[PDB]
């Protein structure tokens, strides 16, 4: 078994690092993808805050299992990692991302987490 | 002021998300860059563990202020973010990275954190 405090870090410290990681990060939990962790970069990309605990589909209903929630479901249900490339999201933006499962010690799936990358300027550079 | 538990997440939860973020992440503290947070991807890339608390230069002395520690210093001292592209590291690997400062509420610099990207296969694909 692992000693988390010594091997990964103390919880408050690790939270503070996460907040400041220079990339868009999100953690979700349970079959309804409740927000469990979001850092400053994430909140910058979406200025809807005081957000932890609520189901994703509930804070972002303007989208609906299409086609992202459905891939969050697939990762949650099957544990198969999923990647997207250059997905449009209405300004008008494009995002790369990877979603992976999070397993408990018993091997069961607890939730998912994502790193997102804003690649708008890269596609917009296609003249 | 921000309510961390509600806005970013509870500390143990956020730590657990961080552990599982599918990208190499590291947090350091103080003028000697003591390890403060490292996730599974990081520990995979460097299987030297039980590592939190120690100064970087002390666990990786085979490198020496060259030319990376020196750029960790520059970010710590000046607060200027730094990016690297395709840095070799002896197998033989190549890494992209971004290092940013972490400021206290008083505006002072507490440490730095990094996201690292292994891009070996991308350069190795140059025939």
From Swiss-Prot, chains A, B:
Residue ranges annotated for the PAC domain, each copy included: 83-127
Entry comment on modification after translation: Autophosphorylated.
Superkingdom, taxonomy of origin: Bacteria
Transmembrane segments: none
Role description: Primarily acts as an independent SigF regulator that is sensitive to the osmosensory signal, mediating the cross talk of PknD with the SigF regulon. Possesses both phosphatase and kinase activities. The kinase domain functions as a classic anti-sigma factor-like kinase to phosphorylate the anti-anti-sigma factor domain at the canonical regulatory site, and the phosphatase domain antagonizes this activity.
Protein known as: Multidomain regulatory protein MT1410
Top-level taxonomy: Bacteria, Bacillati, Actinomycetota, Actinomycetes, Mycobacteriales
């Amino acid at each position: 078994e692992m000693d988390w405090d010594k091997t990964v870090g103390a919880a408050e410290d690790v939270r503070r690092i996460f907040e400041h990681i220079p990339a868009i990060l999100v953690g979700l939990e349970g079959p309804d993808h409740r927000f469990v962790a979001v850092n400053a970069a994430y909140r910058g990309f979406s200025p809807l805050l005081d957000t932890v605990g609520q189901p994703a589909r509930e804070v972002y209903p303007e989208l609906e299992g299409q086609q992202i929630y459905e891939m969050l479901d697939r990762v949650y249900q099957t544990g198969e990692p999923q990647s997207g490339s250059e997905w449009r999201l209405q300004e008008e933006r494009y995002f790369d991302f990877v979603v992976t499962p999070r397993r408990r010690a018993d091997g069961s799936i607890e939730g998912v987490q994502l790193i997102v990358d804003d690649v708008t300027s890269r596609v917009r550079a296609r003249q």
